[PDB]
Design a protein around this ligand. Structure first.
Ligand SMILES: *[C@@H]1O[C@H](CO)[C@@H](O[C@@H]2O[C@H](CO)[C@@H](O[C@@H]3O[C@H](CO[C@H]4O[C@H](CO[C@H]5O[C@H](CO)[C@@H](O)[C@H](O)[C@@H]5O)[C@@H](O)[C@H](O[C@H]5O[C@H](CO)[C@@H](O)[C@H](O)[C@@H]5O)[C@@H]4O)[C@@H](O)[C@H](O[C@H]4O[C@H](CO)[C@@H](O)[C@H](O)[C@@H]4O[C@H]4O[C@H](CO)[C@@H](O)[C@H](O)[C@@H]4O[C@H]4O[C@H](CO)[C@@H](O)[C@H](O)[C@@H]4O)[C@@H]3O)[C@H](O)[C@H]2NC(C)=O)[C@H](O)[C@H]1NC(C)=O
Ligand SMILES: *[C@@H]1O[C@H](CO)[C@@H](O[C@@H]2O[C@H](CO)[C@@H](O[C@@H]3O[C@H](CO[C@H]4O[C@H](CO)[C@@H](O)[C@H](O[C@H]5O[C@H](CO)[C@@H](O)[C@H](O)[C@@H]5O)[C@@H]4O)[C@@H](O)[C@H](O[C@H]4O[C@H](CO)[C@@H](O)[C@H](O)[C@@H]4O[C@H]4O[C@H](CO)[C@@H](O)[C@H](O)[C@@H]4O[C@H]4O[C@H](CO)[C@@H](O)[C@H](O)[C@@H]4O)[C@@H]3O)[C@H](O)[C@H]2NC(C)=O)[C@H](O)[C@H]1NC(C)=O
Ligand SMILES: *[C@@H]1O[C@H](CO)[C@@H](O[C@@H]2O[C@H](CO)[C@@H](O[C@@H]3O[C@H](CO[C@H]4O[C@H](CO)[C@@H](O)[C@H](O)[C@@H]4O)[C@@H](O)[C@H](O[C@H]4O[C@H](CO)[C@@H](O)[C@H](O)[C@@H]4O[C@H]4O[C@H](CO)[C@@H](O)[C@H](O)[C@@H]4O)[C@@H]3O)[C@H](O)[C@H]2NC(C)=O)[C@H](O)[C@H]1NC(C)=O
Ligand SMILES: *[C@@H]1O[C@H](CO)[C@@H](O[C@@H]2O[C@H](CO)[C@@H](O[C@@H]3O[C@H](CO[C@H]4O[C@H](CO)[C@@H](O)[C@H](O)[C@@H]4O)[C@@H](O)[C@H](O[C@H]4O[C@H](CO)[C@@H](O)[C@H](O)[C@@H]4O)[C@@H]3O)[C@H](O)[C@H]2NC(C)=O)[C@H](O)[C@H]1NC(C)=O
Ligand SMILES: *[C@@H]1O[C@H](CO)[C@@H](O[C@@H]2O[C@H](CO)[C@@H](O[C@@H]3O[C@H](CO[C@H]4O[C@H](CO)[C@@H](O)[C@H](O)[C@@H]4O)[C@@H](O)[C@H](O)[C@@H]3O)[C@H](O)[C@H]2NC(C)=O)[C@H](O)[C@H]1NC(C)=O
Ligand SMILES: *[C@@H]1O[C@H](CO)[C@@H](O[C@@H]2O[C@H](CO)[C@@H](O[C@@H]3O[C@H](CO)[C@@H](O)[C@H](O)[C@@H]3O)[C@H](O)[C@H]2NC(C)=O)[C@H](O)[C@H]1NC(C)=O
Ligand SMILES: *[C@@H]1O[C@H](CO)[C@@H](O[C@@H]2O[C@H](CO)[C@@H](O[C@@H]3O[C@H](CO)[C@@H](O)[C@H](O)[C@@H]3O)[C@H](O)[C@H]2NC(C)=O)[C@H](O)[C@H]1NC(C)=O
Ligand SMILES: *[C@@H]1O[C@H](CO)[C@@H](O[C@@H]2O[C@H](CO)[C@@H](O)[C@H](O)[C@H]2NC(C)=O)[C@H](O)[C@H]1NC(C)=O
Ligand SMILES: *[C@@H]1O[C@H](CO)[C@@H](O[C@@H]2O[C@H](CO)[C@@H](O)[C@H](O)[C@H]2NC(C)=O)[C@H](O)[C@H]1NC(C)=O
Ligand SMILES: *[C@@H]1O[C@H](CO)[C@@H](O[C@@H]2O[C@H](CO)[C@@H](O)[C@H](O)[C@H]2NC(C)=O)[C@H](O)[C@H]1NC(C)=O
Ligand SMILES: *[C@@H]1O[C@H](CO)[C@@H](O[C@@H]2O[C@H](CO)[C@@H](O)[C@H](O)[C@H]2NC(C)=O)[C@H](O)[C@H]1NC(C)=O
Ligand SMILES: *[C@@H]1O[C@H](CO)[C@@H](O)[C@H](O)[C@H]1NC(C)=O
Lengths: 132, 105, 113, 128, 348, 128
């Protein structure tokens, strides 16, 4: 039994570093991957990326510089830092656990396989809005 | 992109680009106002909590579009569906597919 | 050397049952006349070996309507409907194809019990 | 191998004109004649015509003249000279012409005639 | 027919009829290329790009997607048409990235006709009137010196012509032993022909599903290119069984210790270097040439007391067999997933 | 005639890598193997390796593996098929490797072996 809870400012002035946090319940921060997702209103979601200990911290190459994912092993939380909020950044954001798994289609030793991700449970959201 | 088929009937919800190689598609759903929830995590594999009759097109087929087949639909099935294809040839899709909407009588 | 191989070696077969013995060569048995020269034989303890078949399926005169040879090229097989007490003993394949001549390895027929 | 592949069964109307193809593969198509024969229930076999695919010279059954027509298509490439297509446009369709049609080829032996039809298409059922 | 009481000394190394067969198969290989299409109009500037495939900087793709102008049936008009090529067939001429074929600067190339095949059919060499062919019927015979049991014969037995550099395939097995053969074993410049008894089955395949594409060059001229890849882009390979290969290596160590002492360490290595079709074993499988790496097989060392090996291949489309001065062969692509089964018979 | 022309004598540093060419002319270069041999004062001759210029298959001395490398360049024109170039990149240079290097070819007789080295280059002196 896990459920997540985000927290953030909600009102953002532009050209300012957005930051968010995410609590835990049940399962700690080391025991699984973590991921951040954003979704605009009436739109498909946008998977911002994933973070884990030991370098498993790949980002969306569209943003690739103005986003930095982080953990909190002292307090057992997940956190996010963003940079340079524009008008498109107003979206509901999600911390979530995800699980890997190898799709193998050819010879294993010839690197003819890949690892897909899938998010099993989710957060609840923070309606972040940029306005002056 | 809204598909409705009287309650109890069948529905075939297509999503995403036509396949190029081997794929591992992931199907999500979205009740209005809520968070998402996974329904299918492989081509035809579901976790606990979600029941059967939610079949998915296999990834071994070459040059077809990802489908999601539901039989015996209900008002709880009325949500926004999403596909996330993982093709062995195209690069990584950091954004999901197009939002497909189901409605019921 | 056109060394012959016999499979299988031992065959416990109840009297009245069926039996079949396979032989394999290392070359073709075909001679210039077109007639491959294969000769299926007998052996009983305390007696001389005797003929069964002197060609592919042309048996020697003195053989009942049960024995037959079959096969092609390099792989050949015997066929017996009913096994008798006279049909016991050791059987053999043989090439009369070309010098040097080779026999098989001997096949003992026994009774199931 | 020698293969004869026809088209699927077709439903037509009276007064129409059916076109049935017969793709042949596995031999030099310019050498052997192609015959067409029909099978009617309660009437048995009946011969329709032949076509020699080298030039396309045809000969028809006498009681089917004015209705039937036969053409062919050869293979013009130095890589696949084997395959070819025969056709039959059977016109003036009546309800009596509901039948199964076959395109056949003779054997390749020395004492084979023309009419000892060795190889057979799978048949095409025409219902009017 | 057998021939008794006779001692004819043989010599496979100063033997004739292997000289004239090596002449005859080259000459007949040339005689099966005169009716075929010359690729003179195809030496042209290529505008190549990467194939649609997940791309990583460290990795290098084995295929390129090359578009180019090409003539048509009509001399006034021309057409933009694309194909897929291997890395080994194209080189870069020098922003943009434009290529050309490698053989353009040395030799106009000849497409193989897709009607004719490359599979071995067994030749029986026959002596004319006034000659005879003797055959050593002896078992333990290193091919030099006296053979006690010879026999004349009308024609030789079935000699299927395999083209293979290392690991000669579909050959004639020995009678009972494993026999190594050389002209002078203490010399090293002479090869050591190994022939073993029980064959090793090898399974080689190409998992790609190619689509060919006829491109007209001129009147009655067809160039068979590669269209789309249908399915996964994968790398071709060969498989042998681990147990049978280690067994046959044990046999050849047991037989190589007859000439080199029993208290001798025998180890193997891969090739020291050279051109691609001598560093690794080349063959043909259903009409397409493989150059399949053998560093996995020949890695061992030996002391005086359901697995398999996946070894990866490469595919060229042009070839330069027997290393002539102005001759090459553009082997056309073939449809579908290709695989074949062969028995490894001997070694060099 | 059979001519073997090497490069000039060269002075290198320890740890460097020398490349020595051997241009051969006057015979069909694809047929005969090219051997490399060295001459050290107070050590005599020592064999380095051979190369067969048809494909480039090489074989090295056992105690020089990892250091030596041999390549060749063929002549691709229907006018001068005779000439060719061999190379030797000898690497991991030590002060002991100060020596005179020769590229040799065997004879053309019937009873000639491979090692009866008939034709000789003029030699290249390498001082480290
Ligand atoms: C030379 O030798 C080399 C090697 O020495 C050979 O190389 C091999 O070549 C083959 C084929 O070329 C490759 O096969 C692929 O393998 C993958 C991986 O298979 C493994 O994983 C599967 C799933 O893992 C699950 O179970 C394991 C424990 O079993 C567990 O650890 C894991 O976490 C997970 O829970 C296993 O099922 C699979 O076992 C299979 O094989 C066993 C061997 O005998 C057998 O005992 C089992 O019963 C089972 O049959 C193995 O452990 C395969 O996944 C892949 O197959 C998929 O992909 C191809 C791509 O086109 C597709 O055509 C196939 O139909 C199949 O696709 C189905 O599965 C997908 C899985 O997600 C699914 O997404 C697809 O939609 C599709 O699913 C649909 O159909 C199935 C029913 O078929 C149904 O279940 C679904 O619900 C849905 O309806 C390939 O088979 C080898 O990887 C490769 N290398 C090695 C080391 O073997 C080479 O071929 C040789 N060369 C020659 C010439 O011989
Ligand atoms: C298969 O065969 C095909 C058939 O030949 C072949 O297609 C042809 O390929 C060539 C080269 O790739 C093409 O030439 C180029 O054409 C570009 C398109 O411009 C055309 O269309 C415009 C409408 O959109 C017209 O307005 C335009 O006309 C104008 O420009 C002319 C330029 O000289 C001028 O004479 C006219 O009077 C008029 O003013 C033209 O008809 C054209 O844009 C291109 O020029 C530059 O632009 C590119 C960016 O768009 C650059 O990437 C490119 O490299 C060119 O840069 C040039 O200029 C730079 C700055 O000066 C220099 O630094 C560069 O080095 C370069 O200079 C070279 O080119 C100059 C001519 O532009 C030349 O004068 C210089 O000496 C130097 O050599 C370029 O002209 C041609 O149009 C194609 N034809 C067709 C029908 O497609 C195809 O490539 C083959 N392969 C394949 C795979 O299909
Ligand atoms: C060592 O020795 C082994 C033993 O012979 C050898 O393996 C054999 O290799 C050959 C050549 O690769 C294989 O022959 C091919 O087989 C397939 C399968 O069909 C045959 O088998 C089935 C079932 O056994 C039979 O029902 C059927 O009738 C066939 O006999 C065929 O697809 C191939 O046919 C094509 O190539 C021929 C080349 O002459 C053509 O004549 C033929 O018409 C086909 O070409 C045409 O069709 C293609 C597809 O439509 C098209 O793309 C072409 O352009 C063309 O139009 C061929 O018969 C044989 O099966 C192998 N045997 C086994 C047991 O695996 C090894 O190759 C050999 N090793 C080496 C290195 O040579
Ligand atoms: C090697 O590289 C070459 C480069 O030229 C590739 O050739 C092109 O490949 C692309 C993509 O594979 C082709 O683009 C597709 O063409 C389809 C058919 O074209 C018709 O329709 C378009 C309208 O889009 C007309 O303009 C055209 O005249 C034809 O009538 C289209 O149906 C495709 O559209 C689909 O995808 C787009 C993606 O943006 C969607 O937006 C659409 O809604 C639709 O779903 C697409 O445009 C292109 O045609 C190829 N060119 C040629 C000359 O063939 C090779 O494919 C490549 N090969 C390999 C193996 O990588
Ligand atoms: C026909 O054109 C072909 C395509 O250009 C030629 O094939 C290639 O030719 C080059 C020679 O120009 C061969 O060598 C390459 O050379 C460059 C530069 O050489 C320098 O670096 C090497 C590295 O060892 C050094 O040895 C030289 O002395 C130079 O200092 C290198 O960057 C390359 O890596 C490569 O060494 C190519 O090997 C060759 N290609 C192949 C596949 O062999 C071909 O020679 C031309 N033929 C004729 C008859 O004109
Ligand atoms: C390969 O096998 C052949 C025979 O099948 C070998 O040829 C013969 O080998 C024997 C030794 O095994 C040689 O005998 C020697 O003869 C000299 C002079 O006669 C004698 O002084 C020695 O003591 C010894 O007995 C024999 O000469 C030789 N014959 C020929 C024609 O070569 C051959 O040596 C084998 N190959 C290798 C590399 O060993
Ligand atoms: C025989 O086996 C040895 C070792 O198993 C092979 O040596 C290895 O060869 C590879 C490629 O030739 C070397 O990889 C490196 O590739 C990069 C590519 O850019 C290049 O920059 C490097 O200089 C190097 O070539 C690898 O380091 C090398 N390993 C050793 C220990 O030497 C050898 O290739 C095999 N022989 C054949 C004919 O395959
Ligand atoms: C497209 O292909 C080109 C070359 O064909 C790629 O450019 C280089 O590719 C090599 C390996 O193929 C890499 O090691 C280099 O790092 C690549 N160059 C750069 C600047 O990254 C290129 O990456 C391919 N992809 C695209 C999108 O152009
Ligand atoms: C390679 O791809 C081709 C794509 O056409 C496959 O051919 C099709 O196969 C299906 C299934 O058997 C048939 O229904 C189609 O009629 C075929 N089309 C054509 C044009 O042949 C082919 O099967 C694939 N090969 C493999 C080994 O998967
Ligand atoms: C090479 O491929 C052949 C298939 O043609 C394999 O032979 C079969 O292997 C399976 C194992 O999956 C056995 O169950 C069959 O009985 C085998 N058939 C025959 C006729 O032998 C063979 O195993 C492959 N070899 C290797 C080394 O992988
Ligand atoms: C040759 O065989 C040896 C072992 O017999 C292989 O050595 C392996 O080397 C890797 C280092 O990269 C080790 O991680 C493995 O444990 C070694 N294998 C064993 C069994 O110890 C070597 O890879 C082989 N050569 C090639 C080219 O594959
Ligand atoms: C080599 O080994 C065999 C048996 O394996 C033995 O008979 C023979 O004497 C040995 N020879 C030497 C020189 O050790």
């Amino acid at each position: 039994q896990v459920h997540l809870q985000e927290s953030g400012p909600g009102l953002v002035k532009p050209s300012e570093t957005l930051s968010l946090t995410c609590n835990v319940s049940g399962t700690l921060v080391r025991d699984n991957y973590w991921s951040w997702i954003r979704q605009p209103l009436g739109k498909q979601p946008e998977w911002i990326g994933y973070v884990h200990d030991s370098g498993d911290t790949n980002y969306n190459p569209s943003l690739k510089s103005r986003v930095h994912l982080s953990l909190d092993k002292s307090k057992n939380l997940v956190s996010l830092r963003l940079t340079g909020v524009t008008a498109a950044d107003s979206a509901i954001y999600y911390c979530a656990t995800t699980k890997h798994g190898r799709r193998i289609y050819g010879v294993v030793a010839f690197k003819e396989w890949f690892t897909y991700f899938y998010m099993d449970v989710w957060g609840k959201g923070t309606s972040v809005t940029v306005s002056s | 992109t809204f598909v409705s088929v009287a309650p109890g009937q069948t529905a075939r919800i297509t999503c995403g680009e036509e396949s190029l190689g081997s794929r591992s598609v992931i199907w999500y759903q979205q009740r209005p106002g809520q968070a998402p929830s996974l329904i299918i995590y492989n081509n035809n594999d579901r976790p606990s909590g979600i029941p059967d009759r939610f079949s998915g097109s296999p990834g071994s087929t070459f040059g077809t579009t990802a489908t999601l087949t539901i039989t015996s639909v209900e008002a709880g099935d009325e949500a926004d569906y999403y596909c996330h294809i993982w093709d062995s040839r195209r690069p990584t899709n950091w954004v999901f597919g197009e939002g497909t909407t189901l409605i019921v009588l | 050397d056109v060394l012959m191989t016999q499979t299988p070696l031992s065959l416990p077969v109840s009297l009245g049952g069926q039996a079949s013995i396979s032989c394999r060569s290392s070359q073709s048995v075909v001679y210039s006349d077109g007639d491959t020269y294969l000769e299926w034989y007998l052996q009983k303890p305390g007696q001389s070996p005797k003929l069964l078949i002197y060609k592919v399926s042309r048996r020697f005169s003195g053989v009942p309507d049960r024995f037959s040879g079959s096969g092609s090229g390099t792989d050949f097989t015997l066929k017996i409907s009913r096994v008798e007490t006279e049909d016991l003993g050791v059987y053999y394949c043989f090439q009369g194809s070309h010098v040097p001549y080779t026999f098989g390895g001997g096949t003992k027929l026994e009774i199931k019990r | 191998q020698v293969q004869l592949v026809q088209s699927g069964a077709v439903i037509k109307t009276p007064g129409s004109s059916v076109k049935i193809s017969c793709r042949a593969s596995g031999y030099n198509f310019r050498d052997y004649s192609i015959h067409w024969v029909r099978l009617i229930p309660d009437k048995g076999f009946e011969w329709i015509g032949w076509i020699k695919p080298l030039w396309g010279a045809v000969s028809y059954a006498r009681q089917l003249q004015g209705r039937v027509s036969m053409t062919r298509q050869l293979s013009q490439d130095p890589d696949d000279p084997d395959w070819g297509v025969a056709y039959m446009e059977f016109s003036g369709l009546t309800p009596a012409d509901t039948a199964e049609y076959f395109c056949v080829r003779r054997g390749s032996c020395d004492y084979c005639g023309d009419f000892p039809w060795q190889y057979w298409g799978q048949g095409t059922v025409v219902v009017v | 027919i057998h021939l008794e009481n006779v001692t004819e000394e043989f010599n496979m190394w100063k033997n004739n009829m292997v000289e004239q067969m090596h002449t005859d198969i080259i000459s007949l290989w040339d005689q099966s290329l005169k009716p075929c299409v010359k690729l003179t109009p195809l030496c042209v500037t290529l505008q190549c790009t990467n194939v649609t495939n997940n791309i990583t900087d460290d990795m290098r793709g084995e295929l390129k997607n090359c578009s180019f102008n090409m003539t048509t049936e009509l001399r006034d008009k021309k057409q933009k048409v694309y194909s897929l090529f291997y890395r080994l067939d194209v080189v870069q001429i020098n922003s943009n990235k434009e290529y050309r074929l490698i053989n353009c600067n040395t030799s106009a190339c000849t497409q193989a006709c897709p009607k004719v095949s490359f599979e071995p059919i067994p030749i029986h060499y026959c002596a004319p009137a006034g000659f005879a062919i003797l055959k050593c019927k002896d078992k333990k015979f290193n091919g030099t010196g006296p053979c006690p049991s010879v026999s004349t014969v009308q024609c030789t037995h079935g000699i299927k012509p395999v083209v293979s550099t290392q690991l000669l395939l579909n050959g004639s097995l020995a009678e009972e032993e494993v026999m190594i053969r050389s002209e002078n074993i203490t010399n090293n410049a002479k090869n050591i022909l190994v022939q073993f008894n029980t064959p090793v089955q090898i399974n080689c395949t190409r998992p790609n599903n190619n689509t060919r594409k006829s491109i007209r060059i001129g009147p009655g001229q067809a160039f068979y290119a590669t269209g789309d890849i249908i399915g996964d882009i994968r790398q071709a390979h060969c498989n042998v069984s681990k147990a049978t290969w280690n067994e046959t290596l044990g046999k050849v160590v047991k037989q190589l210790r007859k000439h080199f002492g029993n208290n001798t360490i025998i180890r193997f290595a891969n090739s020291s270097g050279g051109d691609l079709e001598v560093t690794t074993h080349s063959f043909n499988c259903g009409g397409e040439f493989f150059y399949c790496n053998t560093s996995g097989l020949f890695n061992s060392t030996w002391i005086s007391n359901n697995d398999s090996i996946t070894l990866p291949c490469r595919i060229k489309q042009i070839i330069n067999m027997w290393q002539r001065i102005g001759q090459c062969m553009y082997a056309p692509p073939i449809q579908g997933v290709i695989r074949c089964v062969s028995n490894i018979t001997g070694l060099i």
